[PDB]
Design a protein around this nucleic acid. Sequence first.
RNA 1: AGGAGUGGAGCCUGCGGCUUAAUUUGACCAACACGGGAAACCUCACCCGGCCCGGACACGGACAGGAUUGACAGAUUGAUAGCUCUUUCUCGAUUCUGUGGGUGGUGGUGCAUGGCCGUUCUUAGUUGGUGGAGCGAUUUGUCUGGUUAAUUCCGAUAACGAACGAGACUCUGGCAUGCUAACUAGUUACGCGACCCCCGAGCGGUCGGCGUCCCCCAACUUCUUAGAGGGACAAGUGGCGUUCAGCCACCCGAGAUUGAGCAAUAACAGGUCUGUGAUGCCCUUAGAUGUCGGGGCUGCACGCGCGCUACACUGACUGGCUCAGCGUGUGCCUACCCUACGCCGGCAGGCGCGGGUAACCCGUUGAACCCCAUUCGUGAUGGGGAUCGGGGAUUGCAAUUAUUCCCCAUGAACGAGGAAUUCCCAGUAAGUGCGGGUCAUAAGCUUGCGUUGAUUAAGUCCCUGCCCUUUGUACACACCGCCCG
RNA 2: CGAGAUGGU
Lengths: 98, 59, 94, 71, 53, 162, 112
Amino acid sequence: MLMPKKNRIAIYELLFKEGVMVAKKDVHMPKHPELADKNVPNLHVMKAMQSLKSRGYVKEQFAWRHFYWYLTNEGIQYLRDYLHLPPEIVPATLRRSR
Amino acid sequence: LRITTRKTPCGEGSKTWDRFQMRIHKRLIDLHSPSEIVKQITSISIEPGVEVEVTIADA
Amino acid sequence: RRKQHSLLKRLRKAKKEAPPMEKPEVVKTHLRDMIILPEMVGSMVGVYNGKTFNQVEIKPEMIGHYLGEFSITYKPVKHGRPGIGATHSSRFIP
Amino acid sequence: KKSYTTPKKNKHKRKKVKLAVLKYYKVDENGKISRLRRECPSDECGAGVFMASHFDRHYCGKCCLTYCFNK
Amino acid sequence: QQLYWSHPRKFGQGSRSCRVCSNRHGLIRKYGLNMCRQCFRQYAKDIGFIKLD
Amino acid sequence: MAVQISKKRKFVADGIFKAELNEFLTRELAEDGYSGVEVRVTPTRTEIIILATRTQNVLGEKGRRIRELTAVVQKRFGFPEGSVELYAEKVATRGLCAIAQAESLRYKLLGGLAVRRACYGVLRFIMESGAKGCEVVVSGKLRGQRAKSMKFVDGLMIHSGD
Amino acid sequence: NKGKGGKNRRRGKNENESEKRELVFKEDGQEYAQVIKMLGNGRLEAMCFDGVKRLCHIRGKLRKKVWINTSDIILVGLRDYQDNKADVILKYNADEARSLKAYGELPEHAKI
RNA sequence: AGGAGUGGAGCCUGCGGCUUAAUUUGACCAACACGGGAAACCUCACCCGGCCCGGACACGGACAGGAUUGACAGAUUGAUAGCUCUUUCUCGAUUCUGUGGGUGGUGGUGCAUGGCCGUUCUUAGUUGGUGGAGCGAUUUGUCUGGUUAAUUCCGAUAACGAACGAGACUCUGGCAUGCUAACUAGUUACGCGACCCCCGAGCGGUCGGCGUCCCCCAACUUCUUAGAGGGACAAGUGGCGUUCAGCCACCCGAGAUUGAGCAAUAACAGGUCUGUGAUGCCCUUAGAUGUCGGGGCUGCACGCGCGCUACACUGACUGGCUCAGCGUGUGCCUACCCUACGCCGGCAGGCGCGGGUAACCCGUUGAACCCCAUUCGUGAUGGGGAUCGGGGAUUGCAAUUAUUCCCCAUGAACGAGGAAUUCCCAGUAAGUGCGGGUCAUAAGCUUGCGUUGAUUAAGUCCCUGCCCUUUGUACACACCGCCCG
RNA sequence: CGAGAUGGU
């Protein structure tokens, strides 16, 4: 198996809620920081986000040993389906700046 | 602060060195006043890249 | 000695199960930094050399030495004749 | 940085055996049930999950580092 | 998956590596920099070091 | 921070922060005409000011990219929620900024324009903008399998002293 | 690494006759030979070990690179016509020549 | 002209050759204590063995009496790798399998490249525009002479007016009893207070001597810190100069050359793909050129390079006395810092209990040579300390092919070094010790600092080279060239 | 006015 389905949902729900992801390039640290506490390693985050990039559902950037990922409109459509959320929700970013 | 390094990236050539440094400047001022008015005067002209720190009793 | 007691179990098995008045079979190991304890006397060990196992019959005079002291990692040198470039006068012009 | 000289005790991985799903329950009479292989005395594994029978042991496949009885 | 998949790395050249490029040779531990010597000559101006003498 | 760090470590760490932020912005905002970052502090709040030639590309459709960049800067550097704000600002006299001229020449070459036609194109625009002189250099496999270089120059140019 | 001539001319790329010098044997149309005499003009007299002597020529790739000498051991290509004449393909070092004889590839005639 | 040497001895350390399963590899003035390269493991690329996927995504197949995952025990194994074999529980659509395609690589090419660095080359050199001269490549400007550290100035003049390098510029050293002003810096003085001595006009005192003994709600900025300004210009006097540009001596003065940084046009088949998520093409990709266990990088007839310790009396040993400056310090993933004071031990070291995120604590940083007194007596000696036996601590997951440290014992060559050859002009050479880097453990290296402090020069083109002009040439791959029997 | 030949990368 790549990972338990319990882990895979917890990455996608945090990505859909926040609109962005950040991780360092190191496969050995036992826990990802922040709301990926309650047990998932950052190796599962790197491998999950790679599979989401090759579908076209996230953009990727890299500098000084860190990945950065941004969610995009086709990925919002796919995750709202996969997480079974109501069609009206957009929880991350909405209000126009000045 | 001082750091001294070889100039070459690869270990070939005549043996030249680079000498890098950084200098830090520090000052103290003491006042005889209420705690309510240091908060006023320690808030103007402080716009440039200077650290400012204050402690409520040291004199 | 966390999981280094496993060699002592295999050695005392081999001392127990040998025919009466005959030598044990070899136990073969990577553990070159094991100290010879008085439990280990009159025993056959194969000690790894970087590519092969060399057998040792543990005499009681070996007590307090390392197992790696009796199995050597190289061949003694004996020289062939010097080649081109070995001295300043040795230079070749076509 | 060379051509490779091959080993000769070759396997890729083992093959996992294939068997039909369930033989741990029996119907003996209309409405009479028997359970043929036992649950382990345990907190999470206390129901619906069974110990193996070997020739000299009973073993829990779920609690796999432990839960072995020597008969 | 294996239970023995790492060895101790609490000191020596196995513990530490460059913060910019992950290299292990010729790094600077002074003042908490932890850069490689080739990466330091590249960023020294932005960090705030200068040469005068 | 349960006890404060010493001033030598504090002043070096503040410089290491500005270096990594400038590298991230350099490669995110390259085609969008980035040229520098400035950072300032006030009680409970950090304000980051970012300079570019096409500021509407730094914002995006309703400010999306400013909200995405605020989120990743906070997430990576460990600021608490809402203490970070990003402001985009327009570059004055963009012909006298060397970074905006190096990037626009890079994208002009990457689109397949010829080397001398591109290089005299920026050399004219810098001198029309009011510089006292300039020097443009390109090097590598310019026309053939063996490497070459070209210098283009105009006006005054000093090399020595402070 | 070490030069073994002496001159201004560092203008070339270094010879690197080292590492994966994988040992070469005959195909069809080839022979092993020992050099008997060297002549002018880039040509030589050689004897192969089944006993047919030939006049022999340095291929254009080996010019001013792989210096041949008297009593040296070489690999030679035969012609389908003009059987008196042939061309040099390789030189074997004294370290490689003993490995050919250890594989039984050479008759007991060649000097090393 | 001279000083200290190096080349000769023992040992340390880099290189070649030899040896080997492997002894990984780059580099031959401008390679060789250089890759910040002080490898126990890791680093690690080499050698002997064994697990693992961390093969995205697309298409097809297989599949909820189920795609697939994990494992006790015995055998096996270096191994508690369910690796594999026997056995029979377990998980739940996440995988498996074939084809296409990716991905990683301290793999190959520095003679495919970018960036950086070295060198030609530490010297004074380099270039347009308009005008003049030649059919032309080219040339003048950019110079006969004088002057300067200088293509620096004066002046001359078919050229005129400009650009870069030089210089200016930035940091640094030496001066201010004048300014600003200090309980994280001092001095003087006294309200005074306290211990010790009578040596002192004179008592055991007001008054004298000694103090890192202690308060000030005393006065102040000489000594310490560090901000602003000041000061030096060949400015004054005497000679010499196409009387210009400059050069020599001297007065007055803290001072009449302080030492570094930065640096042009045009080049090199110079070094680096092993600094990089800088990179083209090639190679490899599940019996891997992407992780653990053990070994090697240290192997020794031999040639060479940078160094440390010495051959003694201008010394070695045992006591006593008295003086620095530059720095670093609780590691932000990563888990370790600098140390006073008391007690135990010959020593290395151990236990307890405090201060320091630092002008605040280690700390008045009680440094070495040097200085004063003692013993030895021209003897390979009480000079020298290689080589080797036995025992005790400390780091660490692990010390054998001896990590480093402590103790008793053993006691080599070496009596100022053949032909050759390096560096140096004043607080310099040489002597002497202390910080920083690398560091879990640790300098015979390197990069900085203070302390004791000379002899010889104020010149030349002879040897090796550099700049400018006239001159000759069969050279332009440019004398390490070309060429005859 | 001593002797001063030669040239794989």
